[PDB]
Design a protein around this ligand. Structure first.
Ligand SMILES: Nc1ncnc2c1ncn2[C@@H]1O[C@H](COP(=O)(O)OP(=O)(O)O)[C@@H](O)[C@H]1O
Ligand SMILES: Nc1ncnc2c1ncn2[C@@H]1O[C@H](COP(=O)(O)OP(=O)(O)O)[C@@H](O)[C@H]1O
Ligand SMILES: Nc1ncnc2c1ncn2[C@@H]1O[C@H](COP(=O)(O)OP(=O)(O)O)[C@@H](O)[C@H]1O
Ligand SMILES: Nc1ncnc2c1ncn2[C@@H]1O[C@H](COP(=O)(O)OP(=O)(O)O)[C@@H](O)[C@H]1O
Ligand SMILES: Nc1ncnc2c1ncn2[C@@H]1O[C@H](COP(=O)(O)OP(=O)(O)O)[C@@H](O)[C@H]1O
Ligand SMILES: *CC(=O)N1C[C@@H](C(N)=O)Oc2ccccc21
Ligand SMILES: *CC(=O)N1C[C@@H](C(N)=O)Oc2ccccc21
Ligand SMILES: *CC(=O)N1C[C@@H](C(N)=O)Oc2ccccc21
Ligand SMILES: *CC(=O)N1C[C@@H](C(N)=O)Oc2ccccc21
Ligand SMILES: *CC(=O)N1C[C@@H](C(N)=O)Oc2ccccc21
Lengths: 358, 358, 358, 358, 358
């Protein structure tokens, strides 16, 4: 009979009285409006907000609290994501503003650093294959398809960017631990965020690591995104690292389109990834820095805020950029270079004169 | 989205903690089983049990608490009705037992009564036109169709059983009151049972009374059933009353089938009516009796139970038969005749010697 | 087979030849147009107009004659309701005009009355929970859900507006009668209007009364609407009564949205209720007045019409406002205050000089 | 399997190589376009054109060659009917032009004729009840419903226009023949045109004739349309005939809307009837005329064409108007009056001087 | 909305109060049961019974009154046809009994007649192509397909049974009349039975006559069935006529199956045709006889009944067999031969001694 009554959407509304951006930007009207929508692959709003709902989030710590199951999610649930995307990326408006992508290593300047605290340099991005559900919603078949596509493409790389693909299922635990310690691998997700998002399913099936012979170019397959590209260099020649990064990414993309596959990408958001915080470009060019001359400073938190830098624990700190949506890859790399140059120029403990220089 | 959850059937289960036969024979399993069924016309279980649920029923008073929206109901909701029908009709089992219908006025004997307390004699039955929803569920169009069919059929009656059809909408209030007082009309339903059953809808549209010239043969159209046939006689010659009743009913049925209409009827239940208490034949042959020599008796209620008689208030009492399902019309009339003959014979106040004679 | 023919809509058209606003504003074209529409929950036009069709209405008495089964009704059947709403609320046009709601007790002035005939003061409004069918169409599950939501919300009230919820099913008949006499309860619906609308179903299941300790703030749950809020004061300090009313209503609404529920509300109509006469705000601020110095007046009905006041029997009269749609709550309260001030000022029997003062 | 192929629409195209307006205005493109459309009641193009296809039509005789099964037909198959309607009604364009209806008997003048050849006067129109399929497609139930509606409405007529309804099924053959001879009945359809359209189905069930006591106002029920209204007068006082016609038609329409029924009517076409030739108003005001002074004239057909008159065989000729769509009823009646006045003024055989006077 | 109510089937029941086998074997229960069924091609019960309903049938004349729209009709509507088939074919029971078909011309004996009244001899049968709707329901495309199949098949005939196909649309009226007079053509259907059955649609499109050079073997395409085969001989050598008939029929069937087409045929009924009277074999072997020595006999109708013969008007009488279902073709031919031999043997007017000899 059609006279049976459904649960009112308000009955399913989460209890967000002690939470922290989905919780603040989710309202009864929005949930009721989106309670019945769904992407063509079956993704639904509750699945998007499950990770945030499960984890209330510690005070003073801002977490997005949602994920996307496929490309169509950002369109179907735009009314919810858009405020979150805007709040995350310091005012960027997905509805109106547009994103531009450039990967030219000629524009960059400076590049060379000073071997004082740079230690190492790295650049990282993510890429999702179109037509395949994202890790939060991907099934075993889709995950295996992503792995096959990426592996077959990378097999065609020639020259310096030529290496091998190692499957987690076929790798010894000791070797995996050694690679993790050497910063050349990813660990099994254990924090509540990933598992609540449902991205540790079927571990370690269909997760792998492709790295070049020199180990200066790595690609994680099915860890947080369909592909996570990394260009590393145990030094401070960010120019060369970014050059290798962009050229290898271009070659990988060319090989992807050769077989008929395309990276998810649209003008409003750019490259599409799971975490809305990683939308835009996904670039996280950064470096490692030392504790002594820097830890005992006066007000570096304000300095980092002024120069748009993100400081986190190594694994001595790690300094990178904050926002990926909006600015372009070359812009973000230049910003990081200028910020680290300022940091290593005004680090002087021999004298004083820190200027911040917003 | 198909992920939304319906209200569990147990959520809709009525609160029958202070009720009296649907309440005792309705259980969570039955409601859950039938919570989704429905007759082809859209009748549902909640509609069937609404009248009983609304009225808890006074203690010591047994009411069915149920109705049917059409014929298919008794099939669709048989798992629920059948215990109620069996409990009502003192053990009759609809599932196994079968019903037989006869209307021969030759079989009856005796007939003539004594003008002591008989006063008046009456016989009543009900009939439902197949293909049309019953009064609880009938719409305006179906009610008008029932009225048209019945009126056109009765127009063809000739001879003694020839009279006129009076429409309630075209009848003065004073005339209606006079007819009601003369026991030749039906009043607007006001008791909670009928209104809760939803049978007072659109009153007085499409309700009428067809009566012969002598007013000894009446038919109420759309009051409690599609048709309520009555044969009256201000006397005690039950033989003649039943003869006229059966012959007129046969003629009316013949005229009904002439135009292609059929009375609802199936072997298990016989003629189909709204109240499950009226199933079977609907016959309620009875008479009116006096107070003085009778009310002051010793244990008449036991006598009535023993002889299978129903005593109610006139409008001095009214005595008739109890059960309609099972026994046949001739059987019920003979039982009533024998019971009233016993009552009048063993009414002796001049002496004693009541024998009950179960 | 698809060759079977449906009943033409004109066949179902009611017989309104002796009725009084649905009958005047219902025409064959409108019924034919809306004969097949239905709200997503299954509400249909015939259900809306059943209450008016059953009750022809006494001459010179204006009754709306229709009800709404849910919010979408006012949209789906707008072509029928809109003329009715406009005729009821003295020219307000739902299609074009818009409604504004304010609940500020600072704007009100005067407030204090004279203890001559004021006796008592009261304010009343209604509120419907979104996502749940209205009482005319609500099922048992939806009614229980409404009761649970309201009770859980009111449990969070603290301070002066803190009290208890009493369930009808768990309340003695004598206590209920005493509360009714004290004007602190609602009686079981018995008028034909209520029952024909199907709002007495399942009585008294899921009907309750929540009142504060001082009994100056009451809330009827599932009597005529999902919630009926009342603020009472056995005096004439309308200012304080309205202050308590608005602050308590704001707190109740806040607690409602805390759990994810929202009151039905749209700009064109404001708060959505069953009777179209109660649309807009539902406010009926009024007072009780005495008979002697007032009943024997010259042309008080003209005075009430001029000052936009409604006078009805107590249970000495009750004087309040007429229209709720259009004017705002503060506006209506101020109008009532000014009207009663005029009445108690121009009540002079010591002398004459009534001015009406349209 | 869905791989099976339907017959191409061109396969069903009729063989119209020796036909006469459907054949000229039906083309392969139109048939292919409309080969799959259908009115909600199931009417299809082939049904519309069946009557024209079966009857090739004699040369020099123009017949419409199509009919409509219901109102929606004229909308659904407008691409085919519209050229036919325009060609029939001498240039009227249904798509752009609009129709206006008036029935005032005050506007008419003259009226009185000369008892030379007028003999008798008559006016005729047709009317279709909305919501019921037209005779070509109506089933038995719909035909009976039309008859019931018309009979119940006409029962309410009072005064001069009060009479009786006679059913064909209950009328003797001799009486029917006498009525036909007296021009007070219709004969069983036998022409191939009628039967090919399927309008003689179930004869004589549900066909009747309602006529007033004076027999000056007749109504044929279910002969060519749902209703055919006729006002007759064995004389030449066309003014009185038209007055009675219009007033009786107004009363009948009022009684129709009283019960909730409406005549089919839309601005573009006016009153909707089966034959597209009868669209617009259906008025055929005319008279009977004699042979001698008129037949042996010079160029009578030219005079009729110039004056917009239609001359046909009585059952001495019968002269009326040609077009119904476009001009209004009063306009058509005035045109007929002027034409007959001119005919009876220029009929002079005593002398010559015919002027035609286009 | 799904709350709208269909017309009850009893509303559509025909008015058969003055009819004659469908009318007697159609009852309200059967019509109600079959009111919604339909063959896969859309044939419905009302279409089947339309021909009988329209024509009441003269008293003392038995007509089947129904037709079939396709092969599946006899199965879908078996509950109605089966009593009619049984009543028509003197007790044959389609449900239980089975039909056997033989066409061997060796079994027949006698054959040669006496040139006294035989005059001419003829044999006729019908055949329907499987997968194509029967003439009552066939569209233009299906009719053209039947014509194409039959013509292409007959083109392959060689030897004595070689001739030409003449299309009605391409044949002069005078030639058609001459062929009709010579008993070598069929006339345009005009009887009410045919037109009511809807088998004169689109005349003369797709109707033809294929005849051999000697004109002793004819085939009517799309006149009453898809194919009507006839073998004629202006004499009395029934043996040769039947031999040619059976051999030509076998050759035609072989050519039909060559292209992948099959004659409709099932064991219960045999060859499937429109009129249920023609079911079984369709054989009507007969002869023409003279008036003088035969008309003036004593009890010829009794003789015809006893010998199972049918006498009808020529176009002097025509005598053939009565029943086709049951007995086989050879059986029917032998019965006709024996009956005519008896007739021409006991025709003696020179003396008496008629024996009837049931
Ligand atoms: N500049 C760097 N130099 C060396 N190792 C790095 C650098 N940046 C990141 N890593 C390594 O990457 C690993 C994971 O980094 P993570 O916090 O997941 O970055 P992301 O989230 O951008 O992938 C760590 O074990 C860390 O050692
Ligand atoms: N034997 C009788 N004599 C006279 N009137 C009777 C008799 N039986 C019933 N009636 C009349 O029938 C009316 C309604 O009876 P009711 O209780 O409705 O019987 P039922 O329910 O079987 O129709 C009463 O007003 C009563 O006067
Ligand atoms: N100003 C008032 N003072 C005291 N009691 C009141 C006042 N207004 C209403 N009531 C009480 O409310 C009860 C029901 O009122 P009702 O007519 O239903 O108003 P509404 O329809 O607006 O709820 C009555 O029993 C009456 O005593
Ligand atoms: N002016 C008239 N006077 C008398 N009888 C008339 C007149 N006009 C029509 N009739 C009668 O109407 C009958 C049918 O007319 P018909 O040709 O069907 O007109 P329509 O098609 O407009 O109904 C005829 O038998 C004829 O006698
Ligand atoms: N034995 C026969 N000899 C000559 N012509 C015949 C004979 N039988 C039938 N016909 C011709 O067949 C034509 C139509 O016959 P019909 O009554 O339609 O038979 P059926 O219905 O079996 O086809 C008639 O014109 C008739 O002349
Ligand atoms: C930013 C990110 O990678 N996130 C967002 C974070 C959250 N819900 O706030 O949790 C998860 C879980 C799994 C994968 C990615 C993230
Ligand atoms: C027996 C009868 O007519 N009933 C049953 C009774 C009940 N619910 O127990 O109430 C009603 C109401 C309406 C119509 C019939 C009955
Ligand atoms: C105005 C009101 O509260 N109404 C309207 C009234 C009518 N039909 O005119 O009937 C009912 C019935 C139940 C509840 C409310 C009302
Ligand atoms: C014009 C008219 O009344 N027609 C049209 C005519 C045709 N097909 O040309 O056929 C029929 C048949 C029945 C009723 C009316 C008409
Ligand atoms: C027997 C026969 O050929 N029939 C049956 C007859 C009837 N309805 O009784 O009518 C028709 C019409 C058309 C073709 C065949 C028959």
């Amino acid at each position: 009979s059609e006279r049976r009554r459904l649960y009112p959407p308000s009955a399913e509304y989460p209890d967000l009285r002690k939470h922290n951006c989905m919780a603040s930007h989710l309202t009864p009207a929005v949930y009721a409006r989106l309670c019945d929508k769904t992407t063509p692959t079956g993704w639904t709003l509750d699945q998007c907000i499950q990770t945030g709902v499960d984890n209330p989030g510690h005070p003073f710590i801002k977490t997005v609290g949602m994920v996307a199951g496929d490309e169509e999610t950002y369109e179907v649930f735009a009314d919810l994501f858009d405020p979150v995307i805007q709040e995350r990326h310091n005012g960027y408006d997905p509805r109106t503003m547009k994103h531009t992508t450039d990967l030219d290593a000629s524009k960059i300047r400076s590049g060379y650093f000073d071997e004082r605290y740079v230690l190492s340099s790295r650049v990282r991005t993510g890429r999702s294959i179109r037509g395949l559900s994202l890790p939060p919603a991907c099934t075993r078949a889709e995950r295996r398809e992503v792995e096959r596509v990426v592996v077959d493409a990378l097999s065609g790389l020639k020259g310096d960017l030529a290496g091998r693909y190692y499957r987690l299922s076929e790798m010894t635990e000791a070797e995996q631990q050694q690679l993790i310690d050497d910063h050349f691998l990813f660990d099994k997700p254990v924090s509540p965020l990933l598992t609540a998002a449902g991205m540790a399913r079927d571990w370690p099936d269909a997760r792998g690591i492709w790295h070049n012979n020199e180990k200066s170019f790595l690609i994680w397959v099915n860890e947080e995104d369909h592909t996570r590209v990394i260009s590393m260099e145990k030094g401070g020649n960010m120019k060369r690292v970014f050059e290798r990064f962009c050229r290898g990414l271009k070659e990988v993309e060319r090989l992807i389109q050769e077989r008929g596959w395309e990276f998810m990408w649209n003008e409003r958001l750019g490259y599409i990834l799971t975490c809305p915080s990683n939308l835009g470009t996904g670039l996280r060019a950064g470096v490692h820095i030392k504790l002594p001359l820097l830890s005992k400073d006066s007000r570096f938190p304000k300095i980092l805020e002024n120069l748009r830098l993100q400081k986190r624990g190594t694994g001595v700190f790690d300094i990178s950029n904050l926002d990926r949506l909006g600015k372009s890859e070359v812009e973000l790399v230049q910003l990081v270079i200028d910020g680290v140059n300022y940091l290593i120029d005004c680090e002087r403990r021999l004298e004083r004169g820190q200027d911040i220089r917003i």
